[PDB]
Amino acid sequence: MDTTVPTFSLAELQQGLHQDEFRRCLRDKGLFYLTDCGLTDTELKSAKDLVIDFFEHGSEAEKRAVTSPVPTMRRGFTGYSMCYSMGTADNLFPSGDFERIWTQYFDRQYTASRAVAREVLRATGTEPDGGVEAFLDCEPLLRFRYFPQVLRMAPHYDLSMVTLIQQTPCANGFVSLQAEVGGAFTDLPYRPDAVLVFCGAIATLVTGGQVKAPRHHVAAPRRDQIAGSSRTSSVFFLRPNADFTFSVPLARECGFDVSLDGETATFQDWIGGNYVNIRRTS
Amino acid sequence: MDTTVPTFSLAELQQGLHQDEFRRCLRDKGLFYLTDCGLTDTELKSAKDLVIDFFEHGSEAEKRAVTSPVPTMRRGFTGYSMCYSMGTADNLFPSGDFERIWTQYFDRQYTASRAVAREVLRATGTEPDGGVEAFLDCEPLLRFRYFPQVLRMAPHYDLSMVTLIQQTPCANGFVSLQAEVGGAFTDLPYRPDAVLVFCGAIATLVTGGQVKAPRHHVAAPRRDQIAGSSRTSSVFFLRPNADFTFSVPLARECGFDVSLDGETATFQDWIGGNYVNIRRTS
Amino acid sequence: MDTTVPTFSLAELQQGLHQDEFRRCLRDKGLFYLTDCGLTDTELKSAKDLVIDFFEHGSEAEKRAVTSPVPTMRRGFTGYSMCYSMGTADNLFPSGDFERIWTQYFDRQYTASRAVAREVLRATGTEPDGGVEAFLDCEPLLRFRYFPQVLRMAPHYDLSMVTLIQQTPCANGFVSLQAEVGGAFTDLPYRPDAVLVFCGAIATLVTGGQVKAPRHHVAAPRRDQIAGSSRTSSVFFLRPNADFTFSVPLARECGFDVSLDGETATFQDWIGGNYVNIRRTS
Numbered sequence: 001m002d003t004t005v006p007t008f009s010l011a012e013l014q015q016g017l018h019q020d021e022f023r024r025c026l027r028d029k030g031l032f033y034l035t036d037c038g039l040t041d042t043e044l045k046s047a048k049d050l051v052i053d054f055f056e057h058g059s060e061a062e063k064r065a066v067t068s069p070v071p072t073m074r075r076g077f078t079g080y081s082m083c084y085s086m087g088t089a090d091n092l093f094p095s096g097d098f099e100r101i102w103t104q105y106f107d108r109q110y111t112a113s114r115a116v117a118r119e120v121l122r123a124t125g126t127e128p129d130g131g132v133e134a135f136l137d138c139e140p141l142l143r144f145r146y147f148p149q150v151l152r153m154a155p156h157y158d159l160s161m162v163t164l165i166q167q168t169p170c171a172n173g174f175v176s177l178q179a180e181v182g183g184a185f186t187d188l189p190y191r192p193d194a195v196l197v198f199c200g201a202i203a204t205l206v207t208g209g210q211v212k213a214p215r216h217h218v219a220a221p222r223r224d225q226i227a228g229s230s231r232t233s234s235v236f237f238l239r240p241n242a243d244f245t246f247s248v249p250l251a252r253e254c255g256f257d258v259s260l261d262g263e264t265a266t267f268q269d270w271i272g273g274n275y276v277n278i279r280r281t282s
Numbered sequence: 283m284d285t286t287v288p289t290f291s292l293a294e295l296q297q298g299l300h301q302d303e304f305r306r307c308l309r310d311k312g313l314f315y316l317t318d319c320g321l322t323d324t325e326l327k328s329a330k331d332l333v334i335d336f337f338e339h340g341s342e343a344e345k346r347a348v349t350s351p352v353p354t355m356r357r358g359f360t361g362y363s364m365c366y367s368m369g370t371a372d373n374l375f376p377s378g379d380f381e382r383i384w385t386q387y388f389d390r391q392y393t394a395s396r397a398v399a400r401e402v403l404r405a406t407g408t409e410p411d412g413g414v415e416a417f418l419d420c421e422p423l424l425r426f427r428y429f430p431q432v433l434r435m436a437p438h439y440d441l442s443m444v445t446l447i448q449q450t451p452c453a454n455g456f457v458s459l460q461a462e463v464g465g466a467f468t469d470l471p472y473r474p475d476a477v478l479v480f481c482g483a484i485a486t487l488v489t490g491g492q493v494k495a496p497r498h499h500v501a502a503p504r505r506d507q508i509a510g511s512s513r514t515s516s517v518f519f520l521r522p523n524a525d526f527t528f529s530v531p532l533a534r535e536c537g538f539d540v541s542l543d544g545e546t547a548t549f550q551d552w553i554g555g556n557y558v559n560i561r562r563t564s
Numbered sequence: 565m566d567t568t569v570p571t572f573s574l575a576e577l578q579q580g581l582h583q584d585e586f587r588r589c590l591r592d593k594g595l596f597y598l599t600d601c602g603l604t605d606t607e608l609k610s611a612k613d614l615v616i617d618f619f620e621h622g623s624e625a626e627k628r629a630v631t632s633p634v635p636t637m638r639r640g641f642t643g644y645s646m647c648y649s650m651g652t653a654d655n656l657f658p659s660g661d662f663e664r665i666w667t668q669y670f671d672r673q674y675t676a677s678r679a680v681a682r683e684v685l686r687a688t689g690t691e692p693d694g695g696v697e698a699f700l701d702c703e704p705l706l707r708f709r710y711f712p713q714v715l716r717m718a719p720h721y722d723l724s725m726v727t728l729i730q731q732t733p734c735a736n737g738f739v740s741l742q743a744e745v746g747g748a749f750t751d752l753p754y755r756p757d758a759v760l761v762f763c764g765a766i767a768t769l770v771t772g773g774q775v776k777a778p779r780h781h782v783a784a785p786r787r788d789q790i791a792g793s794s795r796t797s798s799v800f801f802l803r804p805n806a807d808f809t810f811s812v813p814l815a816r817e818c819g820f821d822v823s824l825d826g827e828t829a830t831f832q833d834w835i836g837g838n839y840v841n842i843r844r845t846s
């Protein structure tokens with residue numbers, strides 16, 4: 001195999017170009033960069049600038065007013081690092097300016113996520129139980145995370161349908177995010193023109209095993225690079241509804257070690273009553 | 283904010299004094315010391331002395347006779363540390379003397395726990411589904427843990443309604459337990475006259491978000507203090523029944539990242555079929 | 565107590581010999597070596613040789629063709645170590661030669677596992693809900709794991725009915741696997757003539773507390789032994805069906821900290837929708 005992490009334009013995919021290349025990427029890799037999806041570096045910088053302004057300049061009192069009473073990182077602020085989370089509703093916003101910027105940014109991401117998911121399902125000939133549009137009108141979670149200088153994040157796969165990741169780079173050039181491609185870890189650097197997409201385990205489940213869910217982690221710099229090593233990431237998880245229904249025997253055929261009686265099950269039956277975003281192979 | 287960990291007398295709370303102070307503590311802090319609740323240092327020493335006598339002087343055979351066949355730390359003895367656990371029934375007791383002392387101590391703790399929980403629910407105007415008394419007649423767990431000298435315990439929040447903690451101090455004066463208060467970790471030292479109460483996630487859930495569940499951890503001494511660094515803690519978790527029922531949309535409003543179809547759910551639906559006492563934000 | 569890890573011949577057990585010795589082993593230890601069960605070193609070497617030939621000599625492409633799209637270690641190959649997994653169906657085999665050898669080896673293990681489980685249930689007078697044979701016609705998982713040189717595996721107990729383990733030895737003589745026996749960790753070395761059996765938590769549950777589920781872990785060599793320290797293990801888990809049904813109050817009597825409403829429950833109710841193989845006491 002070529003272990004190159006490919007790039008696809010969403011616009012060309014939506015026109016039916018590169019079908020074989022895409023299908024083969026999904027099955028053998030499960031990850032790719034995505035251009036022409038409505039997501040520019042400019043916007044990433046509008047949103048990143050206002051949130052980082054809050055991480056740095058927001059009072060204790062202002063942070064408290066947008067902190068959930070249980071510290072789940074589902075909505076609002078969570079303070080060696082800081083996080084800002086959002087979904088389609090129940091959001092906590094520091095101000096009217098933040099809210100316009102972050103609502104627009106969320107929506108752009110949720111649109112791109114749905115749009116690439118529709119292409120994954122089309123490329124694999126997949127009609128989810130309940131149909132495509134009800135499957136994609138779901139329960140996404142957006143987490144933006146600022147990381148200070150000196151693994152960083154242990155290897156896992158995602159339990160999303162897809163995950164979209166926009167990063168800003170280490171000022172000193174270190175590349176933190178890596179994924180397993182062809183049996184070894186490959187760099188996944190920042191690209192101002194593109195978003196990284198990871199397929200998660202739900203893509204594998206829904207498509208009956210036609211899409212890989214790759215393992216990935218976040219590396220630590222060599223101490224020779226422990227100045228200029230901070231970074232941010234925007235991680236958008238497209239997560240199915242609780243009532244997403246799948247075939248139990250088909251789940252079994254593609255590696256899922258389910259303990260489910262009977263022939264069909266829901267996402268809730270499988271994962272339980274709280275979203276679980278990531279999983280270790282261990 | 284004043285980041286002082288407040289103290290309340292249960293007796294004054296039960297007389298309706300300090301209502302605003304208490305409500306504001308619950309919402310902004312989720313933790314406090316509690317005096318006048320039936321829990322003296324003297325008793326803590328009666329119970330601690332007999333169990334430590336067992337940790338030290340009980341035979342292998344005697345420990346085996348009060349060890350569960352699965353090592354869950356639910357009931358009896360568990361052997362870098364030792365634990366003694368109890369609930370309302372199915373207990374394992376080393377002897378008739380231990381049993382009287384530990385039954386009385388359990389009951390005192392379970393009484394105080396219920397009594398402070400009733401005040402939390404009253405201060406927030408909360409009527410659990412099924413009413414207050416059936417909610418508080420629940421499934422508590424008491425764990426007493428002896429820790430040897432050289433984190434100790436990673437940061438988490440509790441999934442209890444409330445947790446009551448009685449500690450004995452490090453002979454060398456180090457303060458191991460800390461909690462997040464006002465965005466930073468604050469010491470929670472021993473107080474012979476008071477118990478520490480942590481609100482857990484069930485308090486947040488039941489009250490619709492009026493109570494914080496704070497993160498806390500147990501620190502390690504600086505090696506300059508790795509003689510005289512042993513300690514014990516008595517941790518009493520007030521845990522709801524499996525059939526505790528709550529509103530799904532309300533859960534969502536207060537930060538809980540539930541994957542629950544439909545409008546109501548039970549504690550079992552949310553957490554699954556085994557009690558889970560604590561959780562990481564990660 | 566004698567903290568010796570005992571050995572039983574399955575053939576003598578099946579003839580009703582050593583009943584008291586076996587019962588007392590199950591209750592106080594939960595672990596033993598097993599001879600005369602159809603499992604020779606010769607076979608272990610037929611299977612180990614072909615899989616190690618694949619770990620070393622199989623192409624990237626060949627490994628990919630027997631890698632599941634989600635990296636669960638349920639079936640096929642998983643690449644600091646490599647694993648090969650199998651069950652009763654949905655297997656991924658590198659070739660017709662591997663398949664004959666591994667099918668036969670699986671089946672031998674599944675036979676021995678069932679046969680010792682039947683003896684455990686008989687020795688304790690246990691009739692599972694739904695009867696013995698439907699209980700033992702279950703959902704086993706076989707994992708073969710090659711470990712390179714420099715804990716290795718953290719302490720846990722198994723959630724199996726029984727687990728059978730065949731190891732090959734460290735060329736330098738170090739003994740990696742240990743279990744808690746009589747309150748301390750005891751070596752469990754390779755024995756060409758025997759398999760190690762661990763009782764798991766399901767044995768404890770089904771038998772109403774007559775069998776211990778011991779904790780065990782895998783130790784690291786002293787750096788004085790970090791050449792010749794690689795090893796392999798074949799771990800066979802006998803895991804109940806999702807619909808295995810047990811008594812909730814009885815579960816509670818033997819240490820299980822269940823959050824289950826009502827009087828009976830299924831394995832799925834307790835553990836959820838994915839198999840969980842092992843558990844920490846923590």
Ligand SMILES: O=C(O)CCC(=O)C(=O)O
Pocket residue numbers: 153158165167177216218233235278
């Ligand atoms: O921070 C990153 O780039 C990756 C984060 C990630 O994989 C996750 O949150 O799942």
Ligand SMILES: O=C(O)CCC(=O)C(=O)O
Pocket residue numbers: 435440447449459498500515517560
């Ligand atoms: O040992 C302590 O003081 C705290 C223990 C704790 O937070 C717990 O068991 O949840």
Ligand SMILES: O=C(O)CCC(=O)C(=O)O
Pocket residue numbers: 717722729731741780782797799842
């Ligand atoms: O590798 C070994 O010998 C033990 C493995 C083990 O206990 C397990 O996979 O549960």
Ligand SMILES: [Fe+2]
Pocket residue numbers: 156157158163216278
């Ligand atoms: Fe991830």
Ligand SMILES: [Fe+2]
Pocket residue numbers: 438439440445498560
């Ligand atoms: Fe705690």
Ligand SMILES: [Fe+2]
Pocket residue numbers: 720721722727780842
């Ligand atoms: Fe194990």
